[PDB]
Design a protein around this nucleic acid. Structure first.
Ligand SMILES: Nc1ncnc2c1ncn2[C@@H]1O[C@H](COP(=O)(O)OP(=O)(O)NP(=O)(O)O)[C@@H](O)[C@H]1O
Ligand SMILES: Nc1ncnc2c1ncn2[C@@H]1O[C@H](COP(=O)(O)OP(=O)(O)NP(=O)(O)O)[C@@H](O)[C@H]1O
Ligand SMILES: Nc1ncnc2c1ncn2[C@@H]1O[C@H](COP(=O)(O)OP(=O)(O)NP(=O)(O)O)[C@@H](O)[C@H]1O
Ligand SMILES: [Mg+2]
Lengths: 257, 14, 257, 14, 257, 14
DNA sequence: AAAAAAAAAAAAAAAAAAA
DNA sequence: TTTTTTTTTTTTTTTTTTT
C-alpha cells in the first residue's frame, strides 16, 4: 500500500544539513585538535542535540585485532542532580567496559584507566546544567589531567549556573551560540524541507508569501517547530487523499499549537 | 543536498 | 527421514573460523615460543573457551614406541574455590598418569616430574578466577621453574582479582581482549552463519536490512547469542515444513529471550 | 570456508 | 615539514620566568628553612600552580646506594571532599611506597613512618579548599609533630573556609598574594612572550599601542589568558602561511572568548 | 632569558 | 587447633531548598 | 526564623564455615 509506505516515512526522523550545523562541526573540530574546552549555548528548540549527534556519527570508534576500540568522541547525557558517582559510571559504560561495585574513588581510578589507552580526544556533555556543583571538580580535573577537550552543551540557565564559580567559568570561557532562523534563512529552509524532506507527489510551493506567513507565525523561527508542523501537515494531508499541503490543512494543524 | 536518515546513522554505529 | 537427518545436525556443535579466533591463535603461538605468560579477558559470551579449544586441537599429543606422550599444550578448568591440592591432581590426570594418595608436597613433587620429560610448553587455565589466592604461589613457581608459558583466561572480574597482588599482576601483565561484534563484522558473520552453518534448502537472506534489525536487537553482538538464536529458528522452522527462516518465526524465537 | 564439527575434533583427539 | 615542526612547538607548554614566580621561590624558601607554615592566595588564572611546580623542580629527590630517596619537597592535590583516609594515601604514594589495606589509624601510623627518615622539609597542598574540615586536625598535627612546613595554596574562597576555625587560621596566618598584571608589567610581559615564546620568522611588535589595546581588553591582565590567546593566534596565523600575527587574526581569535 | 620546557622539567624528574 | 567472608547494622552527618 | 528530606560514610562486634 503506497499510502502506508509514505506515512511510515514522514513519521520518521532525519538530519538536514544546515548552516548552524556545519558551523558547529568546524568549530568543534578546531577545538578538538587544539585540545581546548568550551561551551555551546542556545534556545531550547534550535537543534543543539542533533547537531552534536551529527558530529559524533562522523567519527566512528575504530577497531584493530587486539586492543580496545579507539573512541575519539564520547557523548553522554546526565540524569537530574547528577553526582560524582554517576558520571564515572556513564563514561565507563559508554566505552563498553563493565562497571563493578566499589566506592567513588574506585569509579574514578577506573575511569581514568579506560580513558587512557583508549584514545579519547573529546567529551561532550549534554544538558550540562543537570550536574551538581560538586561534580565540576571532577570534570575540570579530567580536562586538565588528560588531553581531553570537554564541551558543555546547554540553555541560558547554564550560564547562570556556570557564573556562580570562578574556576569553572574560566575553564569554559569560549562559547558558540545557536539562535532562531529569520528572513532569507528561514524561507530557504522551508524550501529545503519541502524538496528535501516532505517530497509529496505534487508539492505545495511553501515559499510563497501566503504560506510563509502561516509558517512564520506558527513557528517563530525554531527549527523544532518547523519540522513538527510540516510533518503533521503532510501526514494529515495524505491520510485525506491529497497530493500537497494546502492552506486550510496547514492552518488546521497550526491552530492546535 | 543529501539528507541522513537518523535511524540509519544509528544502525551503522560502531 | 530427511527432516530428522537435518534436525540432528542443526542441533549440534561446530567451530566457525572468525577473526578473533585467528588472532588469538597467532598471539598465543607467539607467546608459546617465547615462553612468556599472559592473560586473555573478555565479556562472557564472546567465545573465549571455544577459541582456546580450537587452538588445543591443532596441537595433538605425540607418541613414539616407548616414552610418554609429548604434550605441547595442557588445558584445564578449575572447580570453585580451587586449592593447591586440586590443581596438581588435574595436571596429572590430564597427562594420563594415575594419581595416588599423599599430601600436598607429594602431589607437587609428582606434578613437576610428569611436567618434565613429557614436553609441555604451554598451560591454559580457564575460568582463572576460580582459584584461591594461595594457589597463585604454585602457579608462579611453575611458570618460573619450568619453561612453561601459563595463560589465564577469564572475565573482567579476573582483573579485579589479579590486581589485588603485585607479584601476580606482574607475571601476567600482557593481555589480549575479546569483545562484541558490530557494523560490518556482525553483518558478514550473520551471512557466514547462514551459508556456512544453517544451509537450508532455500535460505533466508539474513543480511537484508529487515532481518539484521531483528538479529541486532536480539543478539547485541555476542556470538553466543547469535548462534543460539539462529539455530533455534532454523529447527523450529523445519519442524513446520519450511525451507527458510522468515520474520515471524525469527521474532517468535527472539521474543522468548 | 571450512567449518569444523566440534564432536569430530574431539573424536579425533590424542 | 617546517610548518608542522613549529606547530608542534607552539602547541606545547613552558614556564616563563616572571617576577611573581621569583618572588614566591624566595618567600617559600625563606619559610622552608625556618620551618614555618603559611598560605598562598590569588585569583584563578594568575599562575599559582605553575609557580609551585617551578619550585618543586628545582629541588629533586636525592639518592644514595642504600636508603630511601631524600625528598625535601612534597606536592599533592586533593580530590573533592577529601577525607583523612585520602591524604595519607597520596603522601605515601608520592614518596613511592606501596599502600596496603588497613583502617585510618593504620594509614596515619605509616604516613608518619615514611615522612620520617626520608627527609621531608616542606609539604605543598594545592587546591587547599577541597579538604573536609575534619582533615585539618591531621594536617595541623603533622605540622606541629614533624619539622615540616605546610603550605596551603588556593583562591579567595580558601580564606572564607579557613576563617571558620580559629585553630587553623592561626597556624596559617602568614600569606603571600598573587594578582593581575598591569601597566608596564603587562606590556613588558607581552614583549617577553613574543621574543621568548612565540619566535615567529618576522614577529609582530606587540608592544605597539594598537596591539596592546587589543590584548589588554582581551586578557585583563591574567597570565593564563595572555598565553592562550597569543598561542591560538600564532598557530592560526602559521596555518595560513603568515610569518607574524596581525590585527585581524588577533581580533578574530579574541572575539571567540 | 632562558625559558624551561615544561615537559623537559618533567622528563628530567627524580 | 587456627583463618576467612560476610553481616547487615543503626545511627551519624551535614546539607540543600523554600516560605 | 522555621520545616522537610536526602544522599554518603564509617566502623563494628557477631556468626558461621572449613582444613
Ligand atoms: N538537520 C536537521 N534535520 C532534521 N531535524 C532537525 C535538524 N536539525 C534540528 N532538527 C530538529 O530539531 C528537533 C530536535 O530538537 P533538539 O535538537 O532537541 O533541540 P536541541 O537542539 O536539543 N535543544 P534541547 O532540545 O533543548 O536540548 C528535531 O525536531 C529535529 O528535526
Ligand atoms: N567460533 C564459533 N563458531 C561457532 N559457534 C561458536 C563459536 N564461538 C562460540 N560459539 C558458540 O557461542 C557460544 C560460545 O560460548 P562460550 O565460548 O562458552 O563463551 P565463552 O567464550 O566460553 N565465554 P564463557 O562462556 O563465559 O566462558 C557457544 O554457544 C558456542 O557454541
Ligand atoms: N609562568 C608562566 N609561564 C608560562 N605560562 C604560564 C605561567 N604561568 C601560567 N602560565 C600559563 O597559564 C596557565 C597557568 O595557570 P595555572 O598554573 O593553572 O594557574 P593556577 O595557578 O592553576 N590557578 P587555578 O584555577 O587557581 O588552578 C598555564 O596554562 C600556563 O601556561
Ligand atoms: Mg591551579
Amino acid at each position: 500500500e503506497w499510502l502506508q509506505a509514505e506515512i511510515a516515512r514522514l513519521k520518521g526522523k532525519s538530519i538536514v544539513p544546515l548552516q548552524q550545523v556545519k558551523t558547529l562541526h568546524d568549530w568543534l573540530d578546531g577545538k578538538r585538535k587544539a585540545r581546548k574546552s568550551c561551551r555551546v549555548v542556545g534556545e531550547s528548540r534550535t537543534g543543539k542535540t542533533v547537531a552534536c549527534d551529527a558530529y559524533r556519527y562522523r567519527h566512528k570508534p575504530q577497531q584493530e585485532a587486539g586492543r580496545p576500540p579507539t573512541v575519539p568522541v564520547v557523548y553522554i547525557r546526565p540524569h537530574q542532580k547528577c553526582g560524582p558517582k554517576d558520571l564515572f559510571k556513564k563514561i565507563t559504560e559508554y566505552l563498553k567496559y563493565r562497571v563493578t561495585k566499589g566506592t567513588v574513588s574506585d569509579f574514578r581510578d577506573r575511569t581514568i584507566e579506560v580513558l587512557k589507552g583508549c584514545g579519547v580526544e573529546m567529551l561532550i556533555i549534554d544538558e550540562a546544567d543537570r550536574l551538581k556543583p560538586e561534580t565540576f571538580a571532577d570534570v575540570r580535573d579530567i580536562a586538565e589531567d588528560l588531553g581531553i577537550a570537554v564541551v558543555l552543551v546547554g540553555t541560558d540557565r547554564l550560564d547562570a549556573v556556570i557564573k556562580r564559580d570562578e574556576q569553572v567559568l574560566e575553564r569554559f570561557r569560549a562559547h558558540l551560540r545557536f539562535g532562531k532562523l529569520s528572513g532569507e534563512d528561514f524561507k530557504n529552509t522551508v524550501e529545503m524541507w519541502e524538496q528535501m524532506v516532505l517530497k509529496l507527489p505534487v508539492s505545495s510551493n511553501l515559499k510563497s508569501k501566503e504560506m510563509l506567513r502561516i509558517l512564520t507565525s506558527a513557528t517563530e523561527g525554531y527549527i523544532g517547530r518547523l519540522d513538527e508542523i510540516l510533518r503533521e501537515a503532510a501526514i494529515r494531508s495524505l491520510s485525506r487523499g491529497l497530493k500537497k499541503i494546502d492552506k486550510a490543512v496547514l492552518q488546521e494543524v497550526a491552530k492546535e499549537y | 543536498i543529501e539528507v541522513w536518515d537518523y535511524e540509519q546513522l544509528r544502525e551503522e554505529y560502531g
